[PDB]
Amino acid sequence: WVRLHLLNIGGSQDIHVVHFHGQTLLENGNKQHQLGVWPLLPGSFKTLEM
């Protein structure tokens, strides 16, 4: 298990759906869902577990 702390900083809608080749993410929160990729939303800080 490794925790994610990928961040995005404003700019101009620089969104990035970070593809992982054969990997599945995990939401870390009150719901704890599972993800494949994540769109890197500017002005938002995302933390997950891997």
Partner: peptide, 15 residues
Amino acid sequence: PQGIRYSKLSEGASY
């Protein structure tokens, strides 16, 4: 595929 923990034999991605 995108979010499936596959094997390299059926990796389907060249890099």
